[PDB]
Design an enzyme around this catalytic site. Structure first.
Site, mmCIF file in Angstrom:
data_model
loop_
_atom_site.group_PDB
_atom_site.id
_atom_site.type_symbol
_atom_site.label_atom_id
_atom_site.label_comp_id
_atom_site.label_asym_id
_atom_site.label_seq_id
_atom_site.Cartn_x
_atom_site.Cartn_y
_atom_site.Cartn_z
ATOM 1 N N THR I 1 0.899 -1.220 0.000
ATOM 2 C CA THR I 1 0.000 0.000 0.000
ATOM 3 C C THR I 1 0.906 1.229 0.000
ATOM 4 O O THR I 1 1.288 1.691 1.068
ATOM 5 C CB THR I 1 -1.030 -0.059 1.194
ATOM 6 N N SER I 2 1.180 1.809 -1.210
ATOM 7 C CA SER I 2 2.022 2.913 -1.385
ATOM 8 C C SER I 2 1.080 4.055 -1.289
ATOM 9 O O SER I 2 -0.033 4.008 -1.833
ATOM 10 C CB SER I 2 2.694 2.947 -2.739
ATOM 11 N N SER I 129 4.167 -0.238 2.381
ATOM 12 C CA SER I 129 4.819 -1.491 2.000
ATOM 13 C C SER I 129 4.972 -1.534 0.534
ATOM 14 O O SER I 129 5.442 -2.540 -0.003
ATOM 15 C CB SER I 129 3.925 -2.731 2.392
ATOM 16 N N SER I 168 0.684 -5.973 -2.708
ATOM 17 C CA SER I 168 -0.225 -5.376 -1.744
ATOM 18 C C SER I 168 -0.560 -3.996 -2.120
ATOM 19 O O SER I 168 -0.900 -3.137 -1.265
ATOM 20 C CB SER I 168 0.379 -5.485 -0.359
#
Ligand SMILES: Nc1ncnc2c1ncn2[C@@H]1O[C@H](COP(=O)(O)OP(=O)(O)O)[C@@H](O)[C@H]1O
Ligand SMILES: [Mg+2]
Lengths: 49, 48, 48, 147, 247, 232, 244, 241, 196, 245
Positions: I1-2, I129, I168
């Site tokens: 999840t940027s 992440s 993710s």
């Protein structure tokens, strides 16, 4: 009832009621010309005659 | 309205049948000049 | 007592109007003035 | 009306536009309404004694208006409109109403004009209750005599 | 001297703060309750001493729970807290012990219990109000109770309280029957209250509500027939008008 | 008026508190002590009382720390409490900040203590005036504590019973003793002179004197008996 | 009269009403200002007077109208101390309701929790009642324009328009005559601005005094928002009145 | 005077508050327990009445505390409410702890202690409640006590608390007997009540009753609050109606 | 999840991937991670979901009061309120929050709060992440004070790389533009960005 | 006025006042003159500190205190009552630095203070504070100066005065505002601050005073509070002496 039946309340002279009261008084005594009555009434807020 | 009206004519109050009204209690902080007003009312009628 | 005072204000206003008799307008206006009961709780209106 | 300097200041305004009065008087023949509005600016103010400032102007104007056979209808609407909107002090706007009675009563410009006109005056001042409740008498006599 | 603690008794017994609280109650608005055999009707009148003030804003008839409503007579501010504290105790003590609203008999005791605390402490005043609480439960039927600022509760068939109590009470005594319909009971109610005021009597300013038989309308969910709608129902002005016209 | 004097949480019309004024009166009623100081030294000289002549005196000088210490005048109960609290503050400064607690800050915390009980219901204005001395980085200071809690830096002051004769004296020599520096002895001398004039119907004894000195290179020490008999 | 118990709000009178609680209704005329609020048809306007007796004060810190939270105003009559404490409590309550229950707190729920809080202050003896009338104004998420006046006793009742202060009765009668003749319970004007103009007109009439742009402070609720207007925005409205 | 706290004493070693709290109980309706050696009957008179008061479906001065001890109520009802709830919890708490029901003597002692505490400690009212206790426990059989609002207790074979205390007690001891019978005991409460009360009707709507018997069944103990229609039935038999 | 937040001349644009992951299952396809805490200050959430959620609402309550009582809050101000909660709950909560907001007097500001809690003024932030793959891309291609269109393109590219390299990351590409003009939502679909 | 209602600080009088809270104001009257002069780029505080016994060390006792490091406070009334109020003002400011990590807004400060006075008028075992506190400084929104009355009431001011000589003090303060429309430059408002307190010390003529003036200026202290000392204070003294004769 039958002696006093009506009640008339008297309040104070108003902001422009206080004005008139000065006028009667200045005339009654001696003066050299006065005109400051527009300010003097603000100073004399809440006064009885 | 209290004093002057029935004095000139008791005559209207008598038509209605309701008593002409008298008794006024004057009150207010001292220096109001309500004793001066006592004079001004009766000055109009020219009353003694 | 309340009734005697309504007829009292009814005849008084009539004379002001310069009418000689009472007369439904004089009765109605005078009715609503001095109904009595609750007339000092206007500012203490936490009472109800 | 508090302080003596702001009344004076409206008299200055009034005076400059009284020079220009012949120009105002010219635009009254083109159409009466146009001529009223330039004067209405100074009389309609929040401050009082402004038709006592502007007394010098409406004294002359209501003679032209009165004298004509059409302009006196716009004259009456003007006199009622001052009463309601402002109605300034007890003598101010009340003077203009009063001056109408003097000129009207003597002139009799027409009989039809005079007869209706008086009704119009009396109408507004039954409603009022100050200085023209005393002047009410003056115009109620005049009217009752004609009838 | 025995008047002004809560701690001082008179020589003759009793506590003054309770006595003076009862005085307070009787100054409040005229409210009355009649028990019927198929309902309970609870009724009061309202005022605001200014017409500018809206009359729905006030609520002097409040459902305490869906099956039990209440009214008062007495000081306004005290009602509003005490109803909050009552709803809140209703959940604590009984809507987690039965998982639904408590019977009428139960909850009378719990509200009466908050009064008992507002006398027990000193430097905390009683509450200013007397409640009527009426509700319905499945084992004792329809019911009516009075809960006094004393911390005592009294069961009632009919009672009235407030300014017009003494006159309302004698009218109720005479006119009550042992078996009345819900509908007849409403008519005895509007009428009783019309003793207290006339010429300003209209359905707008009279709040009158009932605990009758279930309504499926205010249940809000449908398809589960093994639970009952609100026994309480508030009547509107226009509906009170139908009943006042019909008199 | 005199009826608002019942308690400390209530004001009078002209606005006072009668209790603080009363706590103030008490200082005078007790003991007498005279404080004075110099740029290099601070010295307190005080009269100790005894009940009777089988009594062997009660000390009025409390060593706070090896750079601060005080005298008392008025109620002895009140004093024991304020001194104990002050001693706590010096040890605190030492412990956590590694610093000889400044006389200026110290009086202000003392002031804060005082006001807690003046505001609150219960407690009482502390019934004692204290003259606090110390020698820190900023040299000598001498502070005058009051029951109100106002703390006042002076070159020389005196409090207690009939203490004005020391104050008239100190006033006269003021600038004289300010110049006296580097000579602890002479400041002890001046101080004995000041508390003499205050006394009247009693004169000094070996066991009436307690002379308390801290200066430039000396710690706080309380001298008694045969160390006050060079200045008897 | 007297004896005990004008000294206590936890000890009743032989009347049945607490005399000190009544004194908070005599402590509301202390600063000699008057408030007016009226309802529009998607706005609420509230106007209270400003006294700046000396040129020393800055008329920008002299106010009684407060932003309580995004959608909620309040005008206070009576003293400054209880005004701040009430305003704070309200600010804290508004803020709290949201994290608990999610959305913006309705005028009604705020007024009711403050009323219940006033009643508690009278319940206990160790806290006195507040000395202010609070008049809250909002436009509601689902009920639209709303005025709720909460008095320092803990009584709260809504309004179509309300006025408060020592000259109240005069504004109150002025309003009775107005809403009665129209035959409605609202002002039928459809912008916030012509509702601010009407309110100005009516306070001028009732008290009987011309006011200035340094003697009015005006807060305006629209839906979803609340703002207090500065003196120079207040003038626009004034010059609109002064020549129509 | 020495009214002003409850934690004071007086020059004579009385305490006005204990006396005043005691007189509170003669403001509230008659309550009578008569012990007989074949049951204890509790009978009580109501202190409220009117044709729209409901009192024909309800008891409010007969409470079963637990299942073998009950009380009659005399005094303020508000004062009464809290202590009845406390008393029921402690009686029943014993039940849980020791898995047998509380003895009569201990439960009265406990509740007297709680009473006494309000006088002894704090700035609170004493509690103005006089409870007549009627129990059974197999240690002393049938036990009658009443507790004073002062907060002490004494055993009894008959007692009357509540309004007209003095009159009732005289009436009871004229016609009482040590042999007695439970049926003669019921008739005795009804006898006393006619005289003591200021209502000359003395009908079912004013009357509460419960009889506690171990002669009810055998080896078993039964507390029976009678219902309103039984209370009426027994008024014909004693002939008051 | 940027998630990221990038300064530019007129403001700051916060960017996000709306994938929400509980292991290899995607818990919900589309959940914006850009959660407003004030009108002109918005925040980004990465790390543990529940922890950031908890914390966020606690920040809104502080800034509801700050507006109410003491006038306008700041980004600086706001980011300090994050730093306080995270640092005191460094042993119970793990929240990676980038706080950014637009001032009219300081312009756009970005303060990142790492998982232990600190405050770090920086032109640019990436956290999560999914940010641990785009570090290289972002520095080289960045330059201070781009114009909005160019700004959009840089953010768009970086978050699109992050989906390519982190499993993710995914869902729609959210951005919330915090400018003087208002707040503008922007949304972008995979058909458009996979190519770019 | 009447008996009772004074005694307890939460009893409301039949007059709609709370007498105890008034009686505090009267205690503040007796205290030593303080003024604040707001500017368009600073704030100035000056104070009259009487020297009542000449064994006092000069320039060493002050009713000026700093709060945080950007806000000046100066009180009149009872001195140690005034020290406690500034003391709670330091705890609040300090709390504020941890939570929100910024210097206090001057209006933010005023809100917190105003609540504390209100709480000690709110119980029956606390005491109403018998002090005014003029305070303010310069912050993000320019200069602001507020005055907190012992009633728990406060307002912003272009000029604030409290103390004995406070009537004289207001007359000169008003003059300043009229001749200077911008609100007077901060430098010259120090020299002006001295003269106004010199005229107020003629209502207290019996005792000597020591003039302490401190400021906070965006321009000439970098938005920090610091005292006015050395040659600067000397000029202010010399100017004031001149214009009083
Ligand atoms: N309305 C007024 N016009 C002029 N003088 C007035 C007026 N009212 C009050 N006064 C002054 O006040 C004086 C005292 O009033 P007086 O009638 O003796 O009063 P009271 O019975 O109210 O004390 C008057 O004689 C007059 O000088
Ligand atoms: Mg006279």
């Amino acid at each position: 009832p039958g002696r006093l039946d009506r009640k008339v309340e008297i309040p104070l002279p108003n902001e422009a009621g206080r004005l008139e009261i000065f006028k009667i008084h200045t005339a009654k005594v001696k003066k050299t010309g006065e005109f400051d009555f527009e300010a003097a009434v603000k100073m004399s807020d809440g006064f009885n005659g | 309205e209290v004093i002057e009206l029935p004095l000139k004519n008791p005559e209207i109050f008598q038509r209605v049948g309701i008593k002409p009204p008298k008794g006024v209690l004057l009150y207010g902080p001292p220096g109001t000049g309500k004793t001066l007003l006592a004079k001004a009312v009766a000055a109009t009628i020219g009353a003694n | 007592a309340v009734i005697a005072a309504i007829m009292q204000e009814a005849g008084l206003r009539a004379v002001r109007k310069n009418r000689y008799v009472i007369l439904q307008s004089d009765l109605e206006e005078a009715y609503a003035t001095q109904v009595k009961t609750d007339n000092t709780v206007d500012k203490f209106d936490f009472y109800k | 009306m508090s302080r003596d300097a702001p009344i004076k200041a409206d008299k200055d305004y009034s005076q400059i536009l009284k020079e220009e009065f012949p120009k105002i008087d010219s635009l009254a023949q083109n159409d009466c309404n146009s001529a009223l509005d330039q004067l209405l600016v100074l009389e309609k103010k929040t401050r009082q004694a402004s038709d006592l400032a502007s007394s010098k102007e409406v004294l002359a104007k209501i003679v032209d208006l009165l004298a004509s056979r059409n302009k006196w209808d716009d004259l009456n609407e003007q006199l009622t409109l001052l009463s309601k909107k402002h109605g300034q002090l007890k003598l101010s706007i009340q003077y203009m109403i009063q001056k109408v009675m003097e000129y009207l009563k003597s002139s009799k410009s027409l009989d039809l004009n005079t007869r209706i006109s008086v009704i119009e005056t009396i109408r507004v001042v039954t409603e009022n209750k100050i200085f023209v409740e005393v002047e009410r008498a003056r115009v109620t006599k005049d009217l009752v005599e004609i009838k | 001297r025995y008047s002004f603690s809560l701690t001082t008794f008179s020589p003759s017994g009793k506590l003054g703060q309770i006595d003076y609280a009862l005085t307070a109650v009787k100054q409040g608005v005229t409210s009355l309750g009649i028990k019927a055999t198929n309902g309970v009707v609870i009724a009061t009148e309202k005022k605001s001493s200014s017409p500018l003030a809206m009359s729905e804003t006030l609520s002097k008839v409040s459902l305490l729970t869906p099956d039990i409503g209440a009214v008062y007579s007495g000081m306004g501010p005290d009602y509003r807290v005490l109803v909050d504290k009552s709803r809140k105790v209703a959940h604590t003590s009984y809507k987690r012990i039965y998982g639904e609203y408590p019977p009428t008999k139960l909850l009378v005791s719990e509200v009466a219990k908050i009064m008992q605390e507002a006398t027990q402490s000193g430097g905390v005043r009683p509450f200013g109000v007397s409640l009527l609480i009426a509700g319905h439960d499945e084992f004792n039927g329809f019911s009516l109770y009075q809960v006094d600022p004393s911390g005592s509760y009294f069961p009632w068939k009919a009672t009235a309280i407030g300014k017009g109590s003494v006159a309302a009470k004698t009218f109720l005594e005479k006119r009550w029957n042992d078996e009345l319909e819900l509908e007849d009971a409403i008519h005895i109610a509007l009428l009783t209250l019309k003793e207290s005021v006339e010429g300003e009597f209209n359905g707008d300013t009279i709040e009158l509500a009932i605990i009758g038989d279930e309504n499926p309308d205010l249940l809000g969910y449908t398809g589960i027939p093994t639970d009952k709608g609100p026994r309480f129902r508030k009547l509107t002005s226009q509906e009170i008008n139908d009943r006042l016209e019909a008199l | 008026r005199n009826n608002y004097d019942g308690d400390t949480v209530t004001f009078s019309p002209t606005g006072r508190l009668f209790q603080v004024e009363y706590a103030l009166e008490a200082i005078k009623q007790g003991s007498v002590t005279v404080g004075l100081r110099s740029n290099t030294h601070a010295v307190l000289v005080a009269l100790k009382r005894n009940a009777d002549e089988l009594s062997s005196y009660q000390k009025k000088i409390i060593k706070c720390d090896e750079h601060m210490g005080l005298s008392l005048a008025g109620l002895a109960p009140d004093a024991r409490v304020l001194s104990n609290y002050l001693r706590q503050q010096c040890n605190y400064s030492s412990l956590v900040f590694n610093r000889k607690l400044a006389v200026e800050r110290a009086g202000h915390l003392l002031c804060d203590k005082a006001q807690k009980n003046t505001q609150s219901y219960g407690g009482r204005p502390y019934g004692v005036g204290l003259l606090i001395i110390g020698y820190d980085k900023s040299g000598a200071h001498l502070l005058e504590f009051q029951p109100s809690g106002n703390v006042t830096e002076l070159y020389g002051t005196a409090i207690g019973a009939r203490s004005q004769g020391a104050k008239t004296y100190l006033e006269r020599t003021l600038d004289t003793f300010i110049k006296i520096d580097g000579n602890p002895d002479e400041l002890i001398k001046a101080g004995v002179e000041a508390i003499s004039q205050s006394l009247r119907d009693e004169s000094l004894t070996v066991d009436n004197l307690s002379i308390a000195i801290v200066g430039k290179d000396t710690p706080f020490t309380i001298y008694d008996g045969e160390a006050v008999a060079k200045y008897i | 009269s007297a004896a005990g118990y004008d000294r206590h709000i936890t000890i009743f009178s032989p009347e049945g009403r607490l005399y000190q609680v009544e004194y908070a209704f005599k402590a509301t005329n202390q600063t000699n200002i008057n408030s007016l609020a009226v309802r529009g048809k998607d706005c609420t306007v509230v106007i209270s007077q400003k006294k700046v007796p000396d040129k020393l004060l800055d008329p920008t810190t002299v106010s009684y109208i407060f932003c309580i939270s995004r959608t909620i105003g309040m005008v206070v009559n009576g003293p400054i101390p209880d005004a701040r404490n009430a305003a704070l409590r309200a600010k804290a309550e508004a803020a709290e309701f949201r994290y608990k229950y999610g959305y913006d707190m309705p005028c009604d729920v705020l007024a009711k929790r403050m009323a219940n809080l006033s009643q508690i202050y009278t319940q206990r003896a160790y806290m006195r009642p507040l000395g202010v009338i609070l008049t809250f104004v909002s436009v509601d998420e689902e009920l639209g324009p709303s005025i709720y006046k909460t008095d320092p006793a803990g009584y709260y009742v809504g309004y179509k328009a309300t006025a408060t202060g020592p000259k109240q009765q005069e504004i109150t009668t002025n309003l009775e005559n107005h809403f009665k003749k129209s035959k409605i319970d609202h002002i039928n004007e459809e912008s916030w601005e012509k509702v601010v103009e009407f309110a100005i007109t009516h306070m001028i009439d009732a008290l009987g005094t011309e006011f200035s742009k340094n003697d009015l402070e005006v807060g305006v609720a629209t839906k979803d928002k609340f703002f207090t207007l500065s003196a120079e925005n207040i003038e626009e409205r004034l010059v609109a009145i002064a020549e129509q | 005077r020495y009214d002003s706290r409850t934690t004071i004493f007086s020059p004579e070693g009385r305490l006005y508050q204990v006396e005043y709290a005691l007189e509170s109980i003669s403001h509230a309706g008659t309550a009578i327990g008569i012990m007989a050696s074949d049951g204890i009957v509790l009978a009580a008179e109501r202190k409220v009445t009117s044709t729209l008061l409901e009192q024909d479906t309800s008891t409010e001065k007969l409470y079963k505390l637990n299942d073998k001890i009950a009380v009659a109520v005399a005094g303020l009802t508000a004062d009464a409410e809290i202590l009845i709830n406390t008393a029921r919890i402690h009686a029943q708490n014993y039940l849980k702890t020791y898995n047998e029901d509380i003895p009569v003597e201990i439960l009265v002692r406990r509740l007297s202690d709680i009473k006494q505490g309000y006088t002894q400690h704090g700035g609170l009212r004493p509690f103005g409640v006089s409870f007549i206790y009627a129990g059974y426990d197999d240690r002393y059989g049938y036990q009658l006590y009443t507790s004073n609002p002062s907060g002490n207790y004494t055993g009894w074979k008959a007692i009357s608390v509540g309004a007209n205390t003095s009159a009732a007690q005289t009436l009871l001891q004229m016609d009482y007997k040590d042999d007695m019978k439970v049926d003669d005991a019921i008739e005795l409460a009804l006898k006393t009540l006619s005289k003591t009360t200021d209502s000359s009707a003395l009908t079912y709507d004013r009357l509460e009753f419960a009889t506690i018997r171990k002669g009810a069944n055998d080896g078993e103990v039964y507390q029976k609050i009678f219902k309103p229609q039984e209370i009426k039935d027994i008024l014909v038999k004693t002939g008051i109606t | 999840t940027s998630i990221m937040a990038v300064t530019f001349k007129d403001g700051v644009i916060l960017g996000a991937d709306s994938r929400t992951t509980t292991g290899a299952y995607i818990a919900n396809r589309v959940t914006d991670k850009l959660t407003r805490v004030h009108d002109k200050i918005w925040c980004c959430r990465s790390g543990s979901a529940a922890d950031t959620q908890a914390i966020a609402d606690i920040v809104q309550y502080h800034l509801e009061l700050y507006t109410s009582q003491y006038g306008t809050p700041s980004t600086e101000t706001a980011a300090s309120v994050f730093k306080e909660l995270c640092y005191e709950n460094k042993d119970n909560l793990t929240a990676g929050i980038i706080v950014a907001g637009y001032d009219d007097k300081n312009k756009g500001e970005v303060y990142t709060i790492p998982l232990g809690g600190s405050v770090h003024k920086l032109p640019y932030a990436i956290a999560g992440s999914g940010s641990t793959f785009i570090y290289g891309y972002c520095d080289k291609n960045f330059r201070e004070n781009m114009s909005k269109e160019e700004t959009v393109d840089f953010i768009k590219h970086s978050l699109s790389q992050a989906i390519k390299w982190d499993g993710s990351s995914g869902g729609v590409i959210r951005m919330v533009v915090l400018t003087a003009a208002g707040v503008e939502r922007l949304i972008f679909y995979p058909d458009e960005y996979e190519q770019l | 006025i009447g008996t009772g209602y004074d005694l307890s600080n939460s009893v409301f009088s039949p007059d709609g006042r709370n007498f105890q809270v008034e009686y505090a104001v009267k205690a503040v009257e007796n205290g030593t003159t303080s003024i604040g002069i707001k500017c368009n780029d600073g704030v100035v505080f000056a104070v009259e500190k009487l020297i009542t016994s000449k064994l006092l060390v000069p320039q060493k006792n002050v009713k000026i205190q700093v709060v945080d490091r950007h806000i000046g406070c100066v009180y009149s009334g009872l001195i140690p009552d005034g020290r406690h109020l500034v003391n709670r003002g330091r705890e609040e400011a300090a709390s504020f630095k941890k939570l929100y990590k910024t210097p206090i807004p001057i209006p933010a400060f005023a809100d917190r203070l105003g609540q504390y006075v209100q709480a000690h008028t709110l119980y029956n075992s606390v005491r109403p504070f018998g002090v005014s506190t003029i305070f303010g400084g310069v912050d993000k929104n320019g200069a602001h100066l507020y005055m907190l009355e012992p009633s728990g009431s406060y307002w912003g001011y272009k000029g604030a005065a409290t103390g004995k000589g406070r009537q004289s003090a207001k007359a000169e303060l008003e003059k300043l505002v009229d001749h200077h429309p911008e609100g007077l430059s901060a430098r010259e408002a120090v020299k002006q601050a001295a003269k106004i307190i010199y005229l107020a010390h003629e209502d207290n003529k019996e005792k000597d005073f020591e003039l302490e003036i401190s400021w906070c200026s965006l321009s000439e202290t970098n938005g920090l509070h610091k005292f006015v000392k050395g040659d600067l204070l000397q000029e202010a003294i010399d100017f004031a002496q001149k214009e009083i004769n």
